[PDB]
Design a protein around this nucleic acid. Structure first.
Lengths: 209, 56, 120, 122, 114
RNA sequence: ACACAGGUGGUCAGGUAGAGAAUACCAAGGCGCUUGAGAGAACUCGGGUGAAGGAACUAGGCAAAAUGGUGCCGUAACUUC
RNA sequence: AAUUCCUUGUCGGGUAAGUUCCGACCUGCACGAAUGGCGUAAUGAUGGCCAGGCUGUCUCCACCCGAGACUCAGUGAAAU
RNA sequence: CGAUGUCGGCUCAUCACAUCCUGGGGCUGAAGUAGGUCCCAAGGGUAUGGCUGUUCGCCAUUUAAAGUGGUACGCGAGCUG
RNA sequence: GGACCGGAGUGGACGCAUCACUGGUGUUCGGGUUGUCAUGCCAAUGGCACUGCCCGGUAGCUAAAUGCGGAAGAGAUAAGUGCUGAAAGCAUCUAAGCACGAAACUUGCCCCGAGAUGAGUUCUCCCUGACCCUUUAAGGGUCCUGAAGGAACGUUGAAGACGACGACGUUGAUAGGCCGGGUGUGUAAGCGCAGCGAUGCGUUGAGCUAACCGGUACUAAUGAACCGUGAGGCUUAACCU
């Protein structure tokens, strides 16, 4: 069940006794706990609500703190909801960590992107630059062409423009598992994932596989 | 040259519709002399929160 | 499109920055107190404190390190005869930025930067 | 790099030094050659002790590169400059019956395995 | 949260030599060749200090017979039978990339023997 | 028209570097030039560095780059010598 | 060919091919000697062709530091 | 006819299918394997060198792929000239 | 010479992301270096010559380094291929009746989405005082007394044009300094000794420290009030009142 939460905590090597060194990414799972199981009379689906981690008492406001009080004292980082599959669930004393992937080979990861501002067009939308030697008078970079012909008099919605980049979702959907540790909450994955060390992320089983 | 029809009082007045921010943060007062200042700024008497600041 | 920085860029070139900060750090140990622009006084707080952490030294390889990189003609000995020793048991925190308002009629953030202890 | 109309030396016996690559091949086109890429080649000086004609057009395979090789290990092995060896049309394996340089034990590719099977240092 | 700085060290070895540049190390490693496990030895001069923790590559340049020959190896890799501190290098630079432009006796490194 | 990135004939000629009233650093002597402070966006004008190939760019090695000086040695076709 | 349109006529050279380039051929649409011929050393803000050298022109882009723009405060236009 | 920039390119896109190339089906004068051919189908997709300022057209390399058309036979208040 | 199927093996074209593979860039770092002026002189340290010059590179970034797929299922069709059968005793793919099926269609996969004002669903949190006046679903005034929360005040960033937004403003970690770690560079800068001296040997596997991240109370980061209050319009059947 559920989409499991963690953090990118670094990069390492696992080696082989054939000779290859094999660089891999390290993820630490913070685990998820149940706060309610929902009835089929709501929306037409059986569903579950889950929370994560603990946070210091000098943060979180009363509208969120009272919803952590109805199940414990750990609190913080908000709430998630998911639909149930192949089994009926209970709330009392129940939690989930890396044992969720004990028979899973590929995973699906969702995180956030780095801030880049208004970001422009050359890197953002691959608007290829032009000559700085021979011709091209004050046209070193030109942002494509916003109109397909000079008769219509319109710019169309089927085109890209410069604008705020970062703080949005990013994903990798075919990511291979290497190792898990049910005592240390380790998830060890093939290659690299979006964002630097300390990036907060959620993980699911891979479905395009 | 660069525009069609001399721009209207409504169109030019739109800039006035964003004005709601209160001036000078409504100041702070010194609780030991009654003079006003900005919320972390120093008095004309060389004092801040009832003690001496800066060489004068 | 800057990705990270640890020390303000500043207006005017690197050959002005160096010449101005060595002179103004000299002026700060020569007068104990300066009034100047806040972001520039924070950049002064970066350079005056490692000089006070040097001013507690006595080794032949430290006592006259880079004399012409931060040079004076009045307090050259007073720096090591009193001023470095005045903070040599303290571990950091040798100054106060003293953030105030106005340099002219308009509010640019001003700093009345001072030593954490003064002679008179 | 290694591309079309490019001067490329040969580790093949009596193959000369002035030899030129004219097409990089192996399936759907990829611009550049490395260790294990097959090329279309021509001989520009041929030498008097030679074995192929000046101006002739035949096949070869790249075996030495300034770029080096890393794909099977993740750590690079690097050679000095760039070189190839001459390759038969239908009769399988290289034309060289003695082939120069130490080569590598990763050159065990089934269609090229004769090179590590002559007299290599590895 | 606890495993920061841990799984980026847990695959490291406990004792591996600090040779620095210009030194020789005499490395022995295994290959499998799609047939059978075989030991092989590589010799040359070290061109960099290998100071990067678990992510430490080390580079050895042969330059003793024929032209060039330069190999990269992983410091913490299990496939290493032997590595040593064979010959010293009395060098005054951090990188030896300048040996790409040396030949004959000028391409040798001195040990000083003192 | 302007505290105007323009124009305007000669004379005198201290030390180190260099062949040199080229040109690097200064003496003697003079100047410190009339918006300022922060920020460190797109996009530009004024600079620096680039691994592999290599003119594949373009009508065109345009432009940029390496080369760059000094004294000796040495120097082809052809020639009105 | 600054001279011959379809015409890159005709034979060869080099090429990886070449209306480009070169050696030549000659029933030259409309070569021809002072509104000069033909050619040679030296010569040119020299056209085209070939190669070597070096190269961010290009392959194909990526980074660093300056001055504006952006924020504040003083000073502040025109065609129409 | 009080502005009504010229060849090609560089450049950035969009619509048509009388489908080039891709998917599905058939007729066949189709033995395999390929062609010849047309009923459906528009989600996606289609040359590098040599000559010319070139588009045209010829040659080298040659097709997963160098189709045909509209938008001033698109494409100068971008660029080149 | 020598197919399709759904299912594997392995590549091309493309894009996005990582900085951990290797390489590059890197004027907050270290080493080398030409000339001259200043600091009176020396030992030397600085200024000027684009960042004078050449050689490595922390942190930051990055492609040439590197990974990966645009799949199956589900629903339902078009072209096509067919069944059973009436009008038309039979015949007939079609009328009545029922199938399968395409780079297409809708899902499935990923993202945004209730101003979807079609303002939906579900949960948490807070406010429980009263008068005065008018021709009043309009408001206006004051006392008594103030919440959940938001901003401002700030310290600041991996967030950024400005706004905005994450972090931090004490049972302490936002930025700086100070320390300790961890990279980089390559053996202090003086003092002896070896030598005709440029230079070498010893102290010294050294010195110097910044951006990466673990400490530390050393320096800095107000009292508070304005916005948001005092239970918030209407009605139906049944019950409470």
């Amino acid at each position: 069940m559920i989409g499991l939460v963690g953090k990118k905590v670094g990069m390492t090597r696992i080696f082989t006794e054939d000779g290859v060194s094999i660089p891999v990414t390290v993820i630490e799972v913070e685990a998820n706990r149940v706060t309610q199981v929902k009835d089929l009379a709501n929306d037409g689906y059986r569903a579950i609500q889950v929370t994560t981690g603990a946070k210091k008492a000098n943060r979180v406001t009363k509208p969120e703190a009272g919803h952590f009080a109805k199940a414990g004292v750990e609190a913080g980082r908000g709430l998630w909801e998911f639909r149930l599959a192949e089994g009926e669930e209970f709330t009392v004393g129940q939690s989930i960590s890396v044992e969720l992937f004990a028979d899973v080979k590929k995973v699906d990861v969702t995180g956030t992107s780095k801030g880049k501002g208004f970001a422009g067009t050359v890197k953002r939308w691959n608007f290829r630059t032009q000559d700085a030697t021979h011709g091209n008078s004050l046209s070193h970079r030109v942002p494509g062409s916003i109109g397909q012909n000079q008769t219509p008099g319109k710019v169309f919605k089927g085109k890209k423009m410069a604008g705020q980049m970062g703080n949005e979702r990013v994903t990798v959907q075919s990511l291979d598992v290497v190792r898990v540790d049910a005592e240390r909450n380790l998830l060890l994955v093939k290659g690299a994932v979006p964002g630097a060390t300390g990036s907060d992320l959620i993980v699911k089983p891979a479905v395009k596989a | 040259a660069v525009q069609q029809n001399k721009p209207t009082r409504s169109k030019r007045g739109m800039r006035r519709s964003h004005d709601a921010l209160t001036a000078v943060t409504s100041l702070s007062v010194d609780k030991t002399s009654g003079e006003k200042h900005l919320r972390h700024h120093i008095t004309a008497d060389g004092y801040y929160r009832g003690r001496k600041v800066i060489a004068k | 499109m800057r990705h990270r920085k640890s020390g303000r860029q500043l207006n005017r070139n690197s050959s002005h920055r160096q010449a101005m900060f060595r002179n103004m750090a000299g002026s700060l140990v020569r007068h104990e107190i300066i009034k100047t622009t806040l972001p520039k006084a924070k950049e002064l707080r970066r350079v005056v404190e490692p000089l006070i952490t040097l001013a507690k030294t006595d080794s032949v390889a430290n006592r006259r390190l880079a004399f012409a990189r931060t040079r004076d003609n009045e307090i050259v000995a007073k720096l090591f005869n009193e001023l470095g020793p005045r903070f040599a048991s303290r571990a950091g925190g040798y100054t106060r930025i003293l953030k105030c308002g106005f340099r002219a009629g308009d509010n640019a953030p001003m700093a009345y930067i001072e030593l954490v202890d003064r002679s008179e | 790099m290694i591309q079309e109309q490019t001067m490329l030396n040969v580790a093949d016996n009596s193959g000369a030094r002035r030899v030129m690559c004219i097409k990089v091949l192996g399936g759907s086109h990829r611009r550049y050659a490395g260790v294990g890429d097959i090329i279309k080649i021509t001989i520009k000086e041929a030498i008097p002790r030679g074995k192929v004609k000046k101006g002739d057009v035949l096949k070869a395979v790249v075996v030495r590169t300034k770029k080096g090789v890393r794909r099977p290990d993740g750590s690079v092995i690097r050679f000095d400059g760039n070189a190839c060896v001459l390759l038969n049309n239908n009769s399988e394996q290289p034309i060289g019956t003695r082939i120069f340089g130490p080569v590598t034990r990763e050159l065990r590719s089934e269609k090229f395995m004769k090179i590590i099977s002559l007299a290599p240092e590895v | 949260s606890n495993i920061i700085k841990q799984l980026e060290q847990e695959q490291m070895k406990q004792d591996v030599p600090s040779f620095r540049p210009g030194d020789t190390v005499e490395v022995k490693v295994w290959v499998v060749e799609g047939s059978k496990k075989r030991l092989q030895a590589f010799e040359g001069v070290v061109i960099a200090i290998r100071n990067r923790g678990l992510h430490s590559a080390f580079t050895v340049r042969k330059i003793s017979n024929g032209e060039g020959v330069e190999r990269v190896f992983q410091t913490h890799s299990p496939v290493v039978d032997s590595i040593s501190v064979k010959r010293r290098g009395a060098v005054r630079k951090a990188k030896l990339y300048y040996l790409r432009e040396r030949t004959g006796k000028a391409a040798r490194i001195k040990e000083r023997l003192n």
